[PDB]
Structures are given as structure tokens and as C-alpha cells.
Amino acid sequence: RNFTVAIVPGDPHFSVDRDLRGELMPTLYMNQNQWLPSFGPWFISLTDNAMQRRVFPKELKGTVNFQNSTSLKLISHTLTTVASTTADFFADARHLTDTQAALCLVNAYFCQKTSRQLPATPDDLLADLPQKLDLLITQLKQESGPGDFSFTYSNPQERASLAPLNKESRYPTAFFQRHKLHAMMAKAGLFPHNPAMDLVFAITSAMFGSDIPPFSAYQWNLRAGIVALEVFILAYGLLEFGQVARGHPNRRLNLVSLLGPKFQPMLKRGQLFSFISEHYIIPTLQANPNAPVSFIFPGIILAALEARSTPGPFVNLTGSRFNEIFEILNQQLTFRDPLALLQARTALRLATEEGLDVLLSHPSPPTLLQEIIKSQFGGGDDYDRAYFMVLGCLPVVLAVVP
Amino acid sequence: RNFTVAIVPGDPHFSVDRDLRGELMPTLYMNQNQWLPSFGPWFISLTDNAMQRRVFPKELKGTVNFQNSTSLKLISHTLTTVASTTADFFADARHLTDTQAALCLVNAYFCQKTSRQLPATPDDLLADLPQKLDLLITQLKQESGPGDFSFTYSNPQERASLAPLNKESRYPTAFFQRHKLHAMMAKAGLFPHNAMDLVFAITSAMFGSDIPPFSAYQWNLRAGIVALEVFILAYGLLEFGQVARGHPNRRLNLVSLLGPKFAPMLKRGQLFSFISEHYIIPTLQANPNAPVSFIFPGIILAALEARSTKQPGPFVNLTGSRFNEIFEILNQQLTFRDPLALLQARTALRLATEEGLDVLLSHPSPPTLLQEIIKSQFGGGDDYDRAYFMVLGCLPVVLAVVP
Amino acid sequence: RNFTVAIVPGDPHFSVDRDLRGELMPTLYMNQNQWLPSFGPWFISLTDNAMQRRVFPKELKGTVNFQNSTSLKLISHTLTTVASTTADFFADARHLTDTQAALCLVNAYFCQKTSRQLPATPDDLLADLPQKLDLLITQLKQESGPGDFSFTYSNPQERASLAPLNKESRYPTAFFQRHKLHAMMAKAGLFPHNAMDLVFAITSAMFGSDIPPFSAYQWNLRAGIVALEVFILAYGLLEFGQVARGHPNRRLNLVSLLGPKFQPPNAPMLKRGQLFSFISEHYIIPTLQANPNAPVSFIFPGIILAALEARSTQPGPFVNLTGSRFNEIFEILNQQLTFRDPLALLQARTALRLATEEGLDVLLSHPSPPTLLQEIIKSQFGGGDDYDRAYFMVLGCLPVVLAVVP
Amino acid sequence: RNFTVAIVPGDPHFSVDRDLRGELMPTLYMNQNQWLPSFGPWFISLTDNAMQRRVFPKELKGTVNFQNSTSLKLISHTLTTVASTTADFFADARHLTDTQAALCLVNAYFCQKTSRQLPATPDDLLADLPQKLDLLITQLKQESGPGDFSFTYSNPQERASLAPLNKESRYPTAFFQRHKLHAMMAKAGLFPHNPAMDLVFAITSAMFGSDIPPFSAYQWNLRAGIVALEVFILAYGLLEFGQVARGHPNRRLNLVSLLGPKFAPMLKRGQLFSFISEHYIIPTLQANPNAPVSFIFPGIILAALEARSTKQPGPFVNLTGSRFNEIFEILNQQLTFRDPLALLQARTALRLATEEGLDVLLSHPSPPTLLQEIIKSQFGGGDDYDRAYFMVLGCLPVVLAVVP
Amino acid sequence: RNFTVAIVPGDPHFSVDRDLRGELMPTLYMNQNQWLPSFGPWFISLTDNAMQRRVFPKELKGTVNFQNSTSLKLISHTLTTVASTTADFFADARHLTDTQAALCLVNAYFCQKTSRQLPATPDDLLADLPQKLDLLITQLKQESGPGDFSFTYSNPQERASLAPLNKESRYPTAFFQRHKLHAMMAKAGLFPHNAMDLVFAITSAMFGSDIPPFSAYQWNLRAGIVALEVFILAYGLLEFGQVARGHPNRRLNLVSLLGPKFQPGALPDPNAPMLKRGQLFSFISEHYIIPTLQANPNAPVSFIFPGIILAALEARSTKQPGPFVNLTGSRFNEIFEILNQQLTFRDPLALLQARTALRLATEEGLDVLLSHPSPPTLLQEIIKSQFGGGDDYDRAYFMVLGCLPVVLAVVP
């Protein structure tokens, strides 16, 4: 079950057993006499905060944290936590993965707007994904009027739950009323209340079985799908005019430094995302068909968590931006409380949805995204941005002896 | 509950959860292969003495103390002890914090001398604090006659107690008679014995009916006078301060300490105005009951050092007397856990600070003596270093582990 | 029972108690303040993978693995596992070692083609081994037609067993039908079904009456063919070898590795087959005189490693973060150091042997086998010349000294 | 209770709580990543021997001993043991400290030889100490005839006891008969047997109470006083023509190296000792009035222990442990065995070995020359500055880089 | 009870409490941040082998063994084992030390061949030892005929015992028949079977009446012959020795090893008159052998010259010409078995058998050394190849120390 992925054109292909991040990071702690990895300003601040926490797992407090680095246990557990943000923890047969729901939405929209035949197999959902996303995004840019990319809650108890309260299948009437992406797809005829044709239901009943109900009747799949679609929209927008051939002076990632002996015309608009879709998204989903969108692009999740936080020069010594990640780590490594871990997972997911709304509500979303990746994660070019979305960090080698 | 502070103009703002010193210092021990922090001559002498002590907490004797540095546990426990100098340990409803009592005194004095409206909210107490302090100080400089900034004790048992003996509400008649700051405020009509009491009008409007008049329950008057002395010394030290210039003797280098985490001259009083608006006010908005020792621990340390200030010429100080009060608190709370002995140790540190504040304020040029102590014992060479030393209680530097 | 071996001409002789690899490697961890050994790209990838394994023996995870090196326990246990690839674990009196079976085959073929007298003693089997191998190889090169160097399985359960299924003495009819080396020896009259059987005349004169004819009990024929493939690859690799030249890409430096233990041009070049003749007379013969039952994997573990790597062989730059190439070695290590399950260890040993046979077929099926072999030794093991290739075949690695302080 | 001392002119004053050696040495182990202290050839040999001893306290065998240095526990316990050499361990009201007895002897001798009034207070005993010692020494140099600076024992059991045997107040008649210093003071009329005026008794009854008996009646004070006087005589003689202003090429002690951030007309004869007496001896005795002479000058005690050793001519490597036996036995008895009687015997052996070595030093034709040789060869001292500091510290520490 | 020794002329004298090797070696582990000792190729091979042994005492496997050195516990226990090779472990009143028996033999031979009066005191035994050895050796060189320096065993059980089997006082008739040294002394009239017995006259005057005649109780004769072989090899090795000149291949550097402990002062003249034949051994006899025996009168010959014992153990091993790497552990088996028996198993009988095996291996190697056509030449080759000794200075110090330590910087 070995699979191969490639992130940017001209770069090497990576053959992995299961997970690229999980198999790449440990290899950076094998030359501890000469160098140790560093994962950027945000991870340096995370490491500083983690070592000060009164309640924090002892196994994540290894000596490497005090040597201008982050221990392997701390960096891998942090990245795993981020990758599980949009994973489904409700044991429900009516549920699709957020990635599958997002793919059904963008494919139904494409069939409604073009004369293209409805997708037959899950492979057809991923075929021409850059073109399907490009059509949805160019129409979303033309969506004038008030509203943002947020869900409307009218109660604090309602906000603390991912699913509708009192075991209901639908969210209250106001829930999606202010969401621009939902409004555009609703106007196009998707997810209707019922005999109005439901393209999403025709796709779900042909590939994902009879158990998946119409998105308007059981609205969890609509909410999860919208949020995963926001991640794909941000990923497309960030790489839209990307170029990687040029050796940028501010390029942080150096695979020759990190890998050592293990390593052996301009791009048109949308070509960098097409490469990542064909060589990374498709092989990742072929190996892990139920992968959440947070597993595909953990860098977008991290940038969204950072967008919530956003006068002059400033030093951030606060730990609030690490609270959701640290609570999951404390619940699964120290307290082992299954209920408290489920609540911690909900808090991380809600914080990400809040940050995604900040990113998409900005007048130029890729500009804010570029600023966060540069300031908090050290990414200076399109090559760094593409690798950061996939890895969740941009590791560098720093000599142990100066 | 995150809050932001700024110490000097042009410098970065620091966002902290609760405490700047407590959150900044641990970050200096995260590159132990390349460098370790050093906190100045006084802390180098403290570290030398602490490792020689027969009775000293074992957790404060970590290996970093023997590597041209001071361990994180030793430096943070020392700074916490200094920051708690004027903290209230009597559980009394009639008590204000020393900072609140000092603010009531300086605000009542300002209303008496200017006829400006009495402060309504605790925010009004801090509004125009540099101007309120400047009026009190310029009048204190004109206070001619004998007397100093000390309390008069007529018994050794009386000296060993912070509150009046035999559970009394007032101190003996001689207690405040030699204090110039008390005498000036008494002559102005503040805290009268019953006559309009401006302090009581302020305390009953913001701090409740439980706070008695300062003349009836004199603990608040004594604590307020001492905290006011710390604010006076802080204002005087920064009075003609400039930070724009990159001084050759500037010890503090935040670019070195923080790494990846990081024109018109200032008029008289402008450096203190910046520290009041960007540090004092946000600190008190987050911790309304903060003692004056938590706001400016550097003044407390300079006061403890002023007591020490005999033969002229070169001299090596291998004595531990200047660390006795801090070390006794550390021994009582980390090793012996004796509640009574810890309370006596806390009183001894507070009395030693009051003794040193009197030395500082009795000097003909108080900021000059203050500058000398900050330079010799703490390594501070300019106004930038002095402002940061008052806030941090030290001036950390990075020293390479390998030479 | 001390014995002496020499690998290449002009180099020192090594006196060992039992095993050269096992006695040489520990001596590289005796200057840990100044330097630590490094065993090449394949072992660097192995070390990376071993430290990531959820189930892996704790004693093999020492600190040296994280200091640009491989711990002594990990490198020695890996090399021992490779050296035991073709060791016989069936306690059977009808069984020869794969080396003995290969020697009987090449000697019977030589007598059939030259009419030289049949070998009388086990020493006669090894006498003129370069010449006996050279005759078999030059005839194998002339073997035109379809087929490769693989065994034909018609069932997955049949593939998972080394011996024939249902305790049978013969493999199914299709088993050897596609093997070129078997076909050439069968056409020459060797191992007939009963016709004079030269192999049986050799086995009954030196290895006792218990060894049955190769056509009747076919395990010895299968084991012998595979060991013969290893000897063929070893001969082909060193065929035009020269060691006198101090090559710029020579990785192995014994002066660096041994230090004070080692007491250190116009010389004529080695003729064709002379480098292999030196290794046969000074390494193969003394090794077999000391350990008569040594498997071919103990003689040349480097060929076994190159064969395991040949199975692995998208176009362009590539980073290999997979652990599949180490699965068989790691499973044996887990089964003998941690779980101590006799059945699971036997299955793991079978899997390593089958993977090696698969890789040997890739190496021999290549149009120029020594060229592919040279490429694998260079890319995965760092060997840049004939000196490195000869030492790699014997040691299973090419250790270098790397300074602990840069 | 903080006090200040100064060792040589032009050097800094040291403010200490109780003990200069005890407070200075720990400060040398605070930069262990860059440097460690080294205390000279004798201490290097001591460290080598201590680590080889089968019976030696484990707490004194720290890692610093194996890193071209001596651990803080080993160096401080060694120096404390040397400083306690002449400390009084008999709980007796009739006893003076050896320093007090030596001061009474030199002051009584000065009053007998000059018109000067008898000292009234203990401060008067120390007033003009260089001048009082100078008078006694110049008369001792004129003492012709046989005899040395040793006590005469006529029995091995008598040699193993500091006090007279069978609880007697006087030592046998032969005991002081060969001692030149005792003979000179006896001829001068000091300590008479009784109506002969006793100047020593007039001093002791005025400052040290009525419990101190006349030196001739209770002779322990006379024996202890004579030995402490020998230490003061050797200290005066060593620094008699000392100069410190000159920066000598062979000066080992470098206080700028050791302390770091914590830190012309010639001296006339006796001026270097006058400085050490006024700025070190007097403030030390004002803070610790009952200090033994071994606490004031432990370097003289160490040089005396080394003088016993001083067989074959030429280059020589000393791998013996005999010179450390007395110090090591005290360390074993107080840190490991805790045997009160054996510790008392070990203390007596160290004191008797010191008395034996002081006799070797004073019997040499040029005592400061032998003293200079020992301080140079065993302790690394190359000039008067080093010699003055060695007498006070008992060693001359140097900083040696951990990385070469 | 401190005593002083000197090994070569012009060098410093060493004052020790009891043992030079035991007191010198620990001083080399006191500067571990800058340097660590290295004891030569044989000890490097020993250290490599010791760390690979499945059965080996854990206390001898310290970290220093893995830092281009040998731990203090391993080097001192190895040297102590070698020094105890010929120590007497039979609690018998009829027994002399092998050194005392060798001295009685060489003194009786000297009295038989010269007009010299029989020695009266144990000091007279050591007086003129170079001259007494020189007379015995020059006569041994003239001993023509077959035979070597070995004992003849006619049974494997007989070979496994140091003393005669079945509690007998005499060895079988064939035992000494092939030994050239025994044959020469027997022809001279020494140890007769009862004829005047010069050896018995010496033993009964200095070592008491308990020592029986060498022909009646033959253990003293066997032990004495073997110790005499060690003295003969020591004399032969230093016979034409010179030390004044600073050789380029001189391994031992006492200035490096001792540092501040060594006061160099005045260095010897390299252009000074040469040492005459026997003068280097005379210096070692007067300044090392005599003071060592005055301090430890019952010292075995292996304690005086452990380097000869090590060279003898190495002589057994001595087939192919050229460069050679020795990865075998056979040469360390006898030493390692003693170490395992006294530090790990604590079996009194097995330790006694291990001690016998080391003594028999040494006797076998001494025969190889003395049977070589030029014994000092083979001895020089072994000291150079296995112990790093390149000159007479190194050879004299190697005989005494059992090794030639060098300082190697921890940081290169």
C-alpha cells in the first residue's frame, strides 16, 4: 500500500507508506550532534508556551525543546492534532467526510452551470477539480451584497454544538442566512427542500449509498461540506498565480538541506494548483478515501487559527492561540477522558471555522494568507506556500554549534 | 484576559497573559546549547552566595547556576519575592492596596491644590498621573526644615510590627512626626482628625464604605506613603529621560534576547508619561490589586541596595547580608513551610525596603544615587536601561556557552 | 580455531576467531568522542525507518542511531540477518547447504563439458573455482530463447513455501520450466530422472548416502541454483577488476577505520578473472575450510543486499521514505529479539529468502548484470570502484569514519 | 557581623561574613563550562592520592577531581582540616588559645627587654606586633649553642600525648631543655617557678581571667604558645624584605582572573608584615578572638608538613601518600567512621607532625630560603605577593580553561 | 614504608608506597577533559576483545574503553593479573618464592664456578647479580646438544598440574631431561640426590630448615628455573643497551605523562660516554630490583618484570608475510579467565585452575623466546609490534611497567 505524491513541478516525488508529514519529520532528528530542526516563529512561540504550561504532557517536554528546536513528540503530536481538525467523530451512517461533501457540492454546481454529465464514480469527482473550483470561485467573486462566510448562532448552547440541538436533522432558519457561499449555491438550485431536481442527492446516492440523506433534510453534510469547500477555495486562491521555477531569495524550504543523501516556460493561471491536485490531492485521496480536508491541507487550518488573533512592533507571549491544540493533547496523553477529548475536538473545529470566515471575508484573501504564512510560518514564496499547506510547517536545519 | 504593555517609545509592545517578568524570563532558557542569560553583578553575587548557603532550597541549586548564569527557578523566585514586597498579607476589609492608597493621596493632594474635580472612577485616579506626581514632587522639593522619609519608632517591639501594637487603629504620636511627605500632606489639610477629608471622599466613592478615614485607621496612610515614595522615585529617575539615542553603555538588547519573536527629543516628564499610559495603566487594568512592588520591582531592589551604601578603594563583596531577607522568604516558603516565620520574613523585607527608600529620598539628588546603584549593581547605563530595570527587576544579557 | 582471510591483492590479511563482519564492526565504536561509523545511503534510510517503527526491539534503538550513524547492535543484527538468508533451518539429513549444492552443480557441469576427472574431496570442488564458473557463465551467455531466472508458481500457497507442498519430494512440473540456468544444466545431462548422474556421483562420494538425486529430492536443486546465481553475480562483478589504482571515488579506507591495528607504483595490472581468483583462494576457500556448512549469504552478503535492492528498481527526482525494503529484515529482528515465536520467525526467514530470489532474477535478467550491480552498489552503498565492490560483497557494507565534531 | 581584611598593599579589601578561605573558594566553581581552579603541585598530588585511597569519604570523590582540578568538597575540607591544626579540643578552663599564649609570651618578652608598660587589653597585645616579633627574632638569631626547636620525649607513649601523662600539670624536666626559644625566654626571666615577678601571669590574669595558671605551673599553655610563636616568627621572617608593587614574571596569583566582575617607593624592612598584621591579623582576631594560629596562617602549617619530607639527589617523582596521611585520617574519622577517640588521635598526629616540620624550618641555616623553596616547588608561589597570599589562603588557585 | 626506585640512568627516581605500576597508572585519568592514556596495539586489541566478550566483568566495561583508551579498572586488573603469574598460591612451608629459588640457583652456580665464598645473607644473593647472571648465560650459550627450555610431560593430567601428581615430592624422571638450563646446572653438581649441596647450604642459612633439598622436593627447582629464565631474558635484552640519546622512535615520554609532578631540572648529555656491556642491567638491578626486593622480599619474578611475562605470552602466538590485522581473542583467554573467576564467579577452585593455565602459558612462551637463535631480537620485535617500544629506554620501562602509556588528546 505504498503511494507517491509530488507537491510542486520540478521537485522530487515522495514515496510513503501512509503519511508524508508523519514519515518526513522523524528523519530530521537523526543528526543531533550537528543540527536540529526549527519550524518557524509560530512553532517557536508554541514551544516557549508549552514548556511554561503547568498542565502539559511530560513526554512532550524533551530536552530538544530547550535547544533552539521542538522535540519530535511535540511537533508530530501538534501536526496530528491539526490534521484531525475536520475528522468525523460522530458514528453516523448518514455522514459523509467533509472532503466528500465539498466534492459533491462543487461537482453539482459545475453540472448545474455547464452541460457536463453528472459524475459517476468518486474518481470523476476529482477529475478537473481546478476547473470545477475555478468556476465556483469566479461566480462567488461576483456575489454582491451583505453577508460573510459565517454561521449564525442565536444561543451560546447552540454555538457549543457541531450538530443541531435536541437531535434535530436541520439547523435553525437563521443558521445559513448570512453565508455567501451557501446563498450562491441555494440560488443555483442546489440542495432544495421537497419535485425539484437535487443534483447533490443524485451524486451521493450513486457513489456513497442510500444512507446519505438530501443536504436540505440532514444539514450536517451541508455545513461540513461548505467548510471543507472554503479550505479548497483558499488553497486555489493562494496558488492561482503561483510560480516555482524561480529560486527566490526569501525561499525558506531547502529540501537538499533537510534530506541530504535521501534526495537524488512559466506556469499559467491555475497550473500550480493543477499540479498539486493531480500529484498530491488525487493520490492522497486514492490511498485514504475518507481523509478529512484538515489532513490534505493542515497549513490552511493553521493559517485560519492564526487569522482569529489578527499598532507597531509586537512580541506575543500569550498562549490563547495554542489552547485548543494543547487541550486535545492534555486530554489524549494525560487525562484520557473520552468525553472531554470530544469537547476539545469540537472547540478546535469551531475555532477553525471562525478563522476561515476571517480569511474569506478579507477583501483580498490570498494577500492575508500570504502575510500569515510569512510572519508566523516563515514562507516567502509560492514554493513555500504550497509546501506549508501540505506539511503544516516549513522546517529548517540549524547548526547545533555556532 | 490577555493584555498589552509598552515600556519605552519606539520599542515593541508585549502581549502577556498575566505577568511580563514571569512570561519573559523562561524564554531565555530555550537555547541552552548556544547561550544562557546573565542578570548583572548583584545577581551574580546573589547566585554565588545562594550556592554557598548551608540552608537553601535544593530546587533553586540547579546546574545553570554553575554555568556563568542563574537557574530559571532561582531568578523567577527571587523576582517574585521582590514583587511581593508591599503585598498585603493581613486579611482586612479596612485595607486598600498600597498602590490604591498612594493614588488616593496624590489625587486628594491634586484636588486640594488645583480645585480640579474629585476623581469619580478608579480610571480617573490614573488619568494625568505624571501631572499629579509632578505637582506633589515640586512642592516636596520646596519643603524646607529638618526631617527625612522615615517612621519614628520608640521601642524595638514596635519596629518589628507593620501594624500598630495591641491591635490599635492608630500609630503612636511620634510615628509620622519626622516624615517630610506626611508633614507636607498634613499641612495641606489631607487626612484630618474629626474638616473636609478629600481622601475619605475618594475611598468611599470607589473602594466602598469599609475603608476608614486615614487619620482614624493609619495603616492605609503608612502603606500609601511608602508606595507614593516608589512612584516619586520612578518619576524623578525618568524626569529628563531620552531613549531615541543608541547609547554606548546600553546593556539591554531585546534583539539578542528575543530573536525570532521580535526625530524630536522627549520633553520633561514625557518618558514617565509613556510608561504611565502604556505600562502602569494597562497593568492596573489587568491586576487592579497589584502592589507597588509588582509595578516597579527595580525601585525595591535599588532601595534594598541603598541600605548597604567602610573603607575607600578596591573592594570584593563576599557578604550575604544584602540577600538575607529575600533568602529567608525563599527558605520559609520552599523548605520549612512555617506560616509565622514566613510572615516575619515578609515584614523584615518590607521594613528593609522602607529603610532603603528613606536613604534614596534623603540623598541631595535622589535620581543620581539611583542611577549609580542601577549602573554598579545592575549594569544599567542609560534611561532605556533604567526604565526596563524598574519594570523587570533586572537587565538580562545573552552570554555564549562556548567562548 | 583461528583462521586468516584476504579480500584484495596488496591489502592486509585478517585473522579472525569465527566471523570477519562480526569481529570487525565492534572495533568502529571505540573512539566515540572523535568519530562514529556511517554505512551508506541504504543503511541511513534503514536507520531512519527503524527509529520510526512502532514495533521494533528497544535494544536496537541506542543513541548512536541519532548521531549520523547506526548503533552497533542495529548494524550487527542487520548484517547477521542478511548473512543467514540462505541458511538451512529445516533439520533434514537429505539436505546439503546451498553452497555445497551450487559447488556440486558447477563441478558436474565442468566435468560434463571438459571431461576432466570428477572431484574426489570437498577441496577439489573449490579447486579452480574461477575457471569452473567462467565456463558455466560463458555458456549461459550463449543461452538464447525465452525465460528468466525465476521459479514458476501456480498458486499463492505454493509461493509461501520453500519446500514442495504436502510434504512432497518434487516441485510441480512447471516450477523450473522458465529458469534459463536450470534449462542449460538439464540440456547438458545433469540431474536426470531414473542415465549417468554426475551430481549424485559427487554427493555420494563426499556428502554421504543420505543426499538423494537432485531430480528425486528437488530442494537441493532449487537451493543450489540460487546459490550458483550468487557465485555467477560475484564472478561477473569482479571479472575485469583492478585494485592497484587509488580511485578518487574509493569509499573504503582501512587506514581510517583500523588506525593502530593496521601496519601499512609500476605494478602490473590484474588480468581477466584475477581479482575473483584472489578472493576465491584467500577468502572463499579459508572461509569454507573453517565453516564447511556456511550458506552463500554468509560468504557474499553484499550480493544478497544488492538483490533485495534490485526488487525496488515514476521518472525524475525521488525521495524514498518507504520501509518495504526493510520489512523482511525487521520482521526477523522483531521475532528473534522481542517475540521469540518459532513459527513466525520461520515465516519471516522464508519471506527474506523469497525476496532475495526475486531480486537475484532482476539482477540476472538485466542485459548487463554487472552494470546494474555497479549502479546499486554506488547509489545505495557508496561503492565507487572494484576495491569497494569486492569489500562490499564480503562485508555487506562499506563503513566510513565521520568526525563527531565538525 | 561582617568584617573586612586586606593582604598586601595596593590590593582590594575583602568583606566576609566569617572566613575568607571558606567564602572565596566556592566562587571558583561557578563557570564550569569555561574554567576550573587548580591549586598547585601539592594539591594535584593530594588529589591523585585521594582518588586512589581504598578508605576515603565518597562525597570527596566528585567528577571535578578527574578534570585537572580538585572538587570544592575536597579542597574546602582539606583547608578546614589544616586551619584546625592548632585548635584546642580539650574542654579546659585553664587553657588559652595557642595564639593568645604566643601573644602573651612575645608581649612579656618585649616588656622585659624594653621600658614599655605591660599590655592592658587584648588589643594592646596586637599593637606593634611587627616590632614585638622583630625584637624576639633578632635576639633568637644571637642565641648561640646546641639545641633546636623540638620537644624532648623520653618514651613513645609520652610522644603520643599532647598534654602531660597521668593528668599532670607539668611536662618532665627534659621536655623543654633542647628548645632554643624556650631557653632564651627562660633566661630572660619569663615563666618562673614560685617571689619572682611573672610578666606572663600578670597579662593572663588581666585579660583572660583568674582561671589561667602560671605557665611554669600548668605547662600546656607554654608548649602551645611556643609552637604558635614559631608560626608567627616564620611568617615575619618570610615577609621581612618583601616587595609587592613590582609585577613579577613568576607571580602565580591573578585575582583579576579568579574574581572577574567581583573585582613607586619600595617597602622598608618589616613593612609588608606590618600591613598584613594591621589589615589581616588584627581584623581576623577582632572577629574571631579564639582563632588558632593555624586559622590565621594555614600556609605556614602546610609548609611545615612539607618540610618533614625534605633521600636521593636529582629529579624525583613523589607517588607516596604519607604527607597526606594526617589530613586524610581526620577526614575519614569525621566524615566516615565518626569515632570520637580515633578523631582525637588523628588531630594529635596532625599537630605533632606540624611541630616536627616547624623545627625543620627553624633549624635550617636560612629559614625563609627553605620556606621560599617549598612555596615555589609545592605550591607554585614565585614572589612575595604569592607568599603573603599563600600564608593566608593555604593555596594559590589559578584558572585553567576546560577546553584546550 | 615508602621506597625509591630508578629504571634508567639520567631519569627521575620514583618514590612509591608499595607498587610503581599501581600508583602510576591512576594518575593518568586525572585530566579527562584534555587527554586519556593509550597503552599500545596489544592493549588496544585487548580492549576491543574485552568489550565483545559475552562473559566479562561489568565493572571493567567503563566508558573510557570506548574513548580511544582503556579504563583504569581494566588496565590495572590486567597488569595485576600479569604481575601475579608466578606468585605462590600453595600454602606450603617447604616453598620459596620463584625469585628466591632463582637467586639460590644462580648463586650456587657462581660459587661452584668461581672461588667466591657462599652467600651469607639475602643481600649477598643480590650483590653482583649482573656478574652472576652473565657467568650463567655465557656458559648456557656454550651448551651444545639437543633440548630446549621446556618441561617434559607424558600425560595430559600431568600437564594440567603445577605440582607433581598424587601429592608426590618429585616430578617423573623425564620432566627435566630436555631442559638445557637444568642439564647445565645438574652437570655442575647443583641439587644432587643423597655429595655437597650448595643450594641447600644457602636455603638452610637464609630461608630456614623447612626448605628441603631441590632434588628431594622439586617444586622449588621448577619455579626457580622458570624465574631464572625471566632474569636471563631481562639481562640479554638490556646487554648492549644505551639510553642517553633521544631516539626518534622512543614512545615513552614521562614529561607528557607526569606534567607538574616531574621536576626536569638538568637533562643528560646525548654526547656523553656510552654505557658499557651490562651497565644498563646493572643500573636496573641496583636501583630497581634490589629496592623492590628490599621492600617486598616475597615478590614473584612476574611482579619484578611483567613485560617479560607479556612478551612470553605473545611469543606463543608467533605464518604469513605482510600486513595483518589480528581480531582473535585467544591471546587474552588466560588473563580474561582469571578476571572472570575473581570478579564475577568467585569460584576458588576455578580461579586456581585459571592461575595455573596462565603460568603454564607463560612457561610455554619463555621456551619459545629462549629457543629462538637470537632471543633479544625476537623480544625486541614483540615489544615494538605489540607494545610500541622503539628503543632500549622503552624496553627497560616496558619490562618494569608491563606497558608504555602515551597521552592522546581527547579533542583532535
Numbering used by the authors:
A (entry chain J): 126 to 319, 329 to 398, 408 to 453, 459 to 550
B (entry chain H): 126 to 319, 330 to 397, 407 to 453, 457 to 550
C (entry chain E): 126 to 319, 330 to 399, 405 to 453, 458 to 550
D (entry chain D): 126 to 319, 329 to 397, 407 to 453, 457 to 550
E (entry chain A): 126 to 319, 330 to 453, 457 to 550
What is the paper's account of this structure, in its own sentences?
Herpesviruses cause severe diseases particularly in immunocompromised patients. Both genome packaging and release from the capsid require a unique portal channel occupying one of the 12 capsid vertices. Recent symmetry-relaxed cryo-EM reconstruction strategies of α- and γ-herpesviral virions provided first snapshots of the unique portal vertex that is essential for DNA encapsidation and release. These studies revealed for the first time a pentameric cap on top of the portal that presumably seals the capsids against DNA leakage after packaging and has been proposed to consist of pUL25 in HSV-1 and its ortholog pORF19 in KSHV. Here, we report the crystal structures of the CTDs of pUL25 orthologs from 3 members of the β- and γ-herpesviruses (HCMV, KSHV, and murid gammaherpesvirus 68 (MuHV-68)), highlighting their structural conservation across the herpesvirus subfamilies. The overall structures of the HSV-1, HCMV, KSHV, and MuHV-68 orthologs are well conserved as reflected by high z scores resulting from structural comparisons using the Dali server and in spite of a low amino acid identity within the “twilight zone” (approximately 20% between the crystallized fragments of HSV-1 pUL25 and MuHV-68 pORF19; illustrated in the structural alignment in S3 Fig).
By contrast, pORF19KCTD assembled as pentamers in 3 independent crystal forms with either a single pentamer or 2 pentamers per asymmetric unit. The pentamer has an outer diameter of approximately 142 Å, a central cavity of approximately 14 Å that is slightly narrower than the diameter of a double-stranded DNA helix (approximately 20 Å) and lateral interactions that bury an area of approximately 1,049 Å2 (±44.5 Å2) on one protomer and approximately 1,147 Å2 (±53.1 Å2) on the adjacent protomer. An extensive interaction network consisting of hydrophobic interactions, hydrogen bonds, and a salt bridge stabilizes this interface, and its calculated total binding energy amounts to approximately 19.2 kcal/mol (±0.9 kcal/mol). The protomers also interact via an intermolecular β-sheet formed by a surface loop (residues 454 to 467) comprising a short β-strand (residues 462 to 464), which runs parallel to an N-terminal 2-stranded β-sheet of the adjacent protomer. These inter-protomer main chain β-interactions are likely to confer extra stability to the pentamer. Our crystal structure also reveals that each protomer binds 2 acetate ions via 4 intra-protomeric hydrogen bonds (acetate622) and 3 salt bridges (acetate623), respectively. One of these acetate ions (acetate623) connects 2 adjacent protomers via polar interactions with the side chain of Gln458 of the adjacent protomer, thereby further stabilizing the pentameric interactions.
